[PDB]
Write a protein that binds this ligand. Structure first.
Ligand SMILES: Nc1ncnc2c1ncn2[C@@H]1O[C@H](CO)[C@@H](O)[C@H]1OP(=O)(O)O
Ligand SMILES: [Ca+2]
Ligand SMILES: [Ca+2]
Ligand SMILES: [Ca+2]
Ligand SMILES: [Ca+2]
Length: 114
């Protein structure tokens, strides 16, 4: 669905441009070094998380939603991704959701941004 004008992820308000920039960064990922970068990586639907996606069919990926983006990190040049993510359709780039680890029901998992 359309990239929203803003989102509130556990108290961090991001703009449409922050969200777009995150997806752009994810789509621009290529091979480097000796292993995959941690992000983007696949997102899976977990019933307990109560997350609704607004793109259609997957596959889906997650990428960090950060200020001053896009996020980038690699082996030996680690930068924290923080708790917030964009979910997008892995192949098309379509926006699916913004999610966050902040306030989630597990420490590894997600809840929908508000
Ligand atoms: N605030 C946070 N920052 C970094 N990783 C987090 C995180 N909260 C949960 N994680 C999870 O901890 C592991 C190490 O980063 C990953 O599985 C990651 O899930 P994620 O990649 O889906 O965000
Ligand atoms: Ca659509
Ligand atoms: Ca704007
Ligand atoms: Ca890469
Ligand atoms: Ca769901």
């Amino acid at each position: 669905c359309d990239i929203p004008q803003s989102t509130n992820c556990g108290g961090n308000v991001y703009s449409n441009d922050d969200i777009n920039t995150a997806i752009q960064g994810a789509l621009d990922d290529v091979a480097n070094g000796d292993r995959p970068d941690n992000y983007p990586h696949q997102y899976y639907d977990e019933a307990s998380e109560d997350i609704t996606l607004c793109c259609g069919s997957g596959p889906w990926s997650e990428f960090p939603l950060v200020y001053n983006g896009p996020y980038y990190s690699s082996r030996d040049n680690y930068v924290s991704p923080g708790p917030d993510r964009v979910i997008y359709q892995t192949n098309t780039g379509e926006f699916c959701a913004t999610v966050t680890h902040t306030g989630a029901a597990s420490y590894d998992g997600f809840t929908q941004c508000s």
